[PDB]
């Protein structure tokens, strides 16, 4: 069944599972034509496929050439996502293949099920959680590799940096979802919080700054404040 607040801790057990988010697969800018009509121009996108226990991220970059000459692109994007996820699974050794794939948007269920017919024992599940993975393109190093790509490419990251050396997967996922929710609600402010102090750097092989345990607590508090505010600045409370 669906993944929800009640079965949340299943994400951190020892059954391999992947989240798939397709929000950023088909990305466009909308603009006016010389005749005053509206047109779209695609820009490179990505599939966000994440193991929440280990932090392993399989970022498949979707180059704009895949849309050339195709119709109904928003529909095609879901099937392209499912094709690439199926190809990733087939590329993994059997002992590394997931036992479940959790899609962040329910419209991915049928495309992924059909592409995974050869894997009847991999469960395809929706979720009732409103996860903020669309904000992945607010992480500078991820946005940079997507925008620079000149052809289809898979890039591997650990979205938790080295956090698992000091904290559990549950705590790491909670920190990630906090950071991303902040970036989604007020990107400018969120990035100001993360980078305000010049002396805390991002290692070359990392995505986020090298905060001490104490600095993470302050940062996390600053992100919760931002989210609550915006929720006020929004609903006026």
């Amino acid at each position: 069944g669906a993944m929800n607040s009640s079965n949340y801790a299943e994400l951190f057990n020892n059954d391999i599972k992947l989240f798939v988010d397709d929000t950023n697969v088909y990305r466009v800018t909308v603009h006016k034509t010389f005749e005053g009509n509206v047109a779209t121009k695609a820009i490179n996108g990505c599939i966000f496929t994440l193991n929440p226990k280990t932090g392993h991220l399989f970022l498949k970059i979707i180059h704009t050439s895949v849309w050339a000459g195709q119709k109904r692109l928003s529909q095609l994007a879901k099937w392209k996502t499912a094709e690439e996820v199926s190809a990733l699974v087939r590329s993994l050794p059997k002992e590394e293949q997931p036992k479940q794939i959790i899609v962040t948007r329910k419209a991915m269920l049928d495309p992924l099920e059909v592409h995974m017919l050869d894997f009847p024992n991999i469960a395809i599940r929706p979720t009732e959680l409103r996860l903020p993975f669309s904000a992945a393109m607010s992480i500078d190093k991820l946005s940079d590799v997507v925008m620079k790509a000149t052809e289809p490419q898979m890039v591997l990251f650990n979205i938790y940096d080295d956090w698992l050396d000091r904290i559990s997967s549950y705590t790491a996922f909670s920190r990630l979802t906090l950071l991303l929710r902040a970036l989604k609600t007020n990107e400018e402010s969120a990035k100001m919080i993360l980078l305000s102090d010049p002396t805390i750097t991002i290692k070359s092989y990392h995505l986020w700054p090298s905060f001490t345990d104490e600095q993470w607590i302050t940062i996390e508090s600053q992100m919760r404040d931002l989210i609550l505010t915006e929720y006020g600045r929004k609903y006026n409370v």
């Binding site: 095609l76 099937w79 499912a82 094709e83 495309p111 099920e113 059909v114 017919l117 050869d118």
Partner: protein, 300 residues
């Protein structure tokens, strides 16, 4: 004109013959049904007055033998049987006919309803869906489950309809996932019509038999089969024009005959709205769309 005579009517029962029905009282001097049109399959069906649960009945073709009904007080139902002595049977029937102990199949001459509902239904194909090879007729009841239902538990008592599953390797060619899921023409035309059914007449025969079992017995798995076979055609972009025109006639007479009080349960809202208003064939079923809109506009 053929006859299905009855040994007796020991229990009060509503008896159906095709789309007709009449009530028989307990121990009423009823001895069967005469004037049954030759050239069609027929169904004779029963609902006991004391247990409206379990409608049950028998599909038969009088060209294949002489059949009669005798009530079994042990198994508690009216059973169809074959009489191999033709002289004895013709004599019994003549005696009953002389004493006017039979009802007459009440066909109006202008009326083509039964032909239109059974146009493609063949007794030999019924006997492959309902496997009981020692009899020439076929028993069906409200509770019998289909092979497909069983896969998701007595095999000898199952409805062996052709399994249709839109999210299956049979339906989806490797490499054509999106294509085949969104346009089921290859599954319809190559897998089912060319491969399994062989021709559209056999496909329509099973579709029509499934509907009739749903309508006469409330057989839920037959209703599922009927809708699946409709949905497979409506969800195909490429269908022979003769098949689309025939489907429109088939469905029109099915919707025409359905009891209004059962449309709530026997009509799947999603399939019909998809089929009449969203599918590739949304504009190819004019007669069916017109009767559905004038008879069941609520469902839509």
């Amino acid at each position: 004109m053929n006859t299905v005579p009855f040994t007796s009517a020991p229990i009060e029962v509503t008896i159906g013959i095709d789309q007709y029905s009449f009530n028989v009282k307990e121990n009423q001097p009823f001895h069967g049904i005469k004037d049954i049109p030759i050239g069609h399959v027929h169904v004779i069906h029963f609902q006991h007055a004391d247990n409206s649960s379990m409608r049950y009945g028998y599909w038969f073709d009088c060209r294949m033998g002489n059949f009669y009904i005798q009530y079994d007080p042990k198994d508690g139902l009216y059973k169809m049987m074959e009489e191999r002595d033709g002289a004895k049977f013709e004599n019994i029937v003549h005696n009953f006919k002389e004493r006017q102990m039979m009802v007459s199949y009440p066909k109006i001459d202008e009326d083509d309803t039964w032909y239109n509902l059974t146009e493609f239904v063949q007794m030999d194909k019924i006997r492959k869906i309902v496997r009981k090879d020692e009899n020439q007729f076929s028993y069906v009841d409200s509770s019998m489950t289909t092979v497909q239902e069983n896969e998701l538990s007595d095999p000898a008592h199952s409805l062996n309809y052709t399994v249709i599953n839109f999210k299956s390797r049979e339906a989806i060619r490797p490499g054509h996932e999106m294509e085949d899921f969104l346009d089921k023409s290859y599954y319809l035309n190559t897998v089912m019509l060319q491969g399994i059914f062989k021709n559209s007449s056999n496909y329509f025969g099973e579709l029509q038999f499934a509907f009739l079992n749903a309508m006469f017995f409330g057989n839920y798995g037959s209703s599922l089969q009927w809708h699946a076979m409709i949905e497979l055609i409506c969800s195909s972009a490429t269908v022979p024009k003769h098949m689309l025109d025939k489907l429109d006639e088939i469905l029109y007479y099915q919707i025409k005959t359905l009891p209004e009080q059962y449309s709530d349960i026997l009509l799947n809202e999603r399939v019909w709205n998809i089929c009449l208003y969203s599918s590739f064939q949304k504009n190819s079923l004019h007669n069916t769309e017109k009767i559905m809109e004038n008879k069941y506009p609520e469902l839509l």
